[PDB]
Amino acid sequence: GSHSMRYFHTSVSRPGRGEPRFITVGYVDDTLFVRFDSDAASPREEPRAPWIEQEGPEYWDRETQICKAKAQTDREDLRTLLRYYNQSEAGSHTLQNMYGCDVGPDGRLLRGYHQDAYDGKDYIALNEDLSSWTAADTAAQITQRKWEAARVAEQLRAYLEGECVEWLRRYLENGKETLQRADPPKTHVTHHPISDHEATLRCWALGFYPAEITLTWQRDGEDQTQDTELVETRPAGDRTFQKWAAVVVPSGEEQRYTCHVQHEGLPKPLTLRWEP
Amino acid sequence: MIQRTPKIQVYSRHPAENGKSNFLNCYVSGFHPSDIEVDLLKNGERIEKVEHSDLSFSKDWSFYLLYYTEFTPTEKDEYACRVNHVTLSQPKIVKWDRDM
Amino acid sequence: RRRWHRWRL
Ligand code: NA
């Protein structure tokens, strides 16, 4: 189907404790494929998926230099933001940046992105037009004026419509074993006595990829949204994800309850019940 | 500055079977700022050489990390995750429950 | 692959 590529970056200042810490990671869909951490002894961008390992030394050298450069420009930008917000040099602050692209099943650009946040709040974002900006406040408007003057959007647009999509397509091909495979959830229902009067029914979805999933409980066909404990989808640590949904059921009433699972890896939504 | 307290889940990679090697995970998410300290505990003591993912974030800019270690669950051994963050006056301890 | 970031806030 559709796919995405994202590069995420975080710099965190630490006054009196040297230069900011810089960490960046790249993803295709829900798959991590590259990482860089400035605090590694002689830091390099490193592979984190098998299908990127085949890129040659020139690729890793360029990537590494780009990461080092962004760490350095982030240091300058953190200093600028202290000025823009009239802040002291004593505190730790955070600068986050994301950029990348979404493509459709045919490989065509669906959306490009480039956006920044300061201290966990929106700062400036490239709009969906890839031609104009949304500034969150009067500080970000200063950046906007500079970036309008320098025709920054046009340069980002050229990357997002060109290289971003072209390299994503390359990765999807080289990684076709995994990036183009959905792993359906393995599902089951468990029963957890609370007392002689009631028990929890917990519906599990394990080992699925990608992360998007819907899990719901029904009682005689009616959705139990308000009475369901639904945990956040969580990584298993091996590429796949987990989720569960639980409801408290009076003794003897279990056969009224069905769990429903939707995942792109499932041809049709599944219906499960507790089987003693 | 607005701060967001971490969500915490402690769980295993595979369904727990006593005597069978597995991975113990502590997933912390939805937090800001990014500095956070996480320990995994076996019978109240810190497990050594725990690994973690590289810092990343969600669409809303909040951070997430996975801490993990190999472990072999038993009937009697108790595992937990201890999390400290600026939003917490006291570190939060979440016990591992093999049924969650 | 990445892009060089030339810009400053
Ligand atoms: Na921090």
Does one domain contain both A208 and A88?
A: no
Does one domain contain both A28 and A8?
A: yes
Contact between chains at A116 and C4 (C-beta distance less than 8 A): no
Give the number of domains in chain A: 2
Query: In this structure, how many other beta carbons lie within 10 angstroms of the beta carbon of residue A44?
Result: 15
Closest CA to A178 of A69, A56, A52, A20: A52
Does one domain contain both A246 and A147?
A: no
What b/e string do you get for A79-109 counting C-beta neighbours within 10 Å, with b at 16 or more? eebeebeeeeeeebbbbbbbbbbbbeeeeeb
Does one domain contain both A124 and A244?
A: no
Does CATH place domain B1-100 in 2.60.40.10?
Answer: yes
Does one domain contain both A91 and A187?
A: no
Can you read off the two tokens belonging to residue A63? 């990537």
Question: What is the Cα–Cα distance from A68 to B51, expressed in whole angstroms?
Answer: 24
Whether the CB-CB separation of C2 and A63 falls below 8 Å is answered with yes
Ligand 1 centre to CA of A177 (Å) is 37
Can you read off the two tokens belonging to residue B67? 């801490």
User: Which of A158, A181, A204 is the endpoint of a domain?
Assistant: A181
Task: Name the residue facing B1 among A117, A119, A235 (closest C-beta).
Answer: A119
User: Which of A148, A163, A181 is the endpoint of a domain?
Assistant: A181
How far CA A201 is from CA of A182, A272, B55, in Å, comes to 27, 11, 34
The approach used to solve this structure was X-ray
Ligand 1 centre to CA of B92 (Å) is 18
Indicate the residue type of A175. G
**Residues 38 through 97 of chain B touching chain A, CB cutoff 8 Å:** 53-57, 61-63, 66, 68
Q: Give resolution, Å, one decimal.
A: 1.4
Does one domain contain both A147 and A28?
A: yes
Query: Tell me, what CATH number does A8's domain have?
Result: 3.30.500.10
Whether the CB-CB separation of A13 and A81 falls below 8 Å is answered with no
Does one domain contain both A32 and A75?
A: yes
Indicate the residue type of A40. A
Can you read off the two tokens belonging to residue A228? 């369901």
Can you read off the two tokens belonging to residue A68? 């080092």
Does one domain contain both A164 and A189?
A: no
Closest CA to A10 of A62, A63, A77: A77
- Site of tokens 């917490």: B88
Residues 6+ positions from A180 with CB-CB distance below 8 Å: A172
Does one domain contain both A94 and A132?
A: yes
Ligand 1 centre to CA of B63 (Å) is 10
Contact between chains at A80 and C7 (C-beta distance less than 8 A): no
**CA B41, B46, B48, B49: dihedral to nearest 10 degrees?**
60
Does one domain contain both A155 and A194?
A: no
Does one domain contain both A162 and A52?
A: yes
Classify A276 as helix, strand or coil: coil
Report which DSSP code applies to A127: -
Closest CA to A33 of A242, A241, A239: A239
**CA A215, A220, A225, A228: dihedral to nearest 10 degrees?**
-70
Query: Tell me, what CATH number does A248's domain have?
Result: 2.60.40.10
Domain that holds residue A139: 1-181
* Touching chains, B (3+ CB pairs < 8 A): A
Does one domain contain both A118 and A217?
A: no
- Site of tokens 């979440």: B94
Peptide bond into A210 cis (omega under 30): yes
Domain ranges in chain B are 1-100
User: Which of A150, A181, A212 is the endpoint of a domain?
Assistant: A181
Extended strands (E) in chain A: 3-12, 21-28, 31-37, 46-47, 94-103, 109-118, 121-126, 133-135, 186-193, 198-208, 214-219, 222-223, 229-230, 234-235, 241-250, 257-262, 270-272
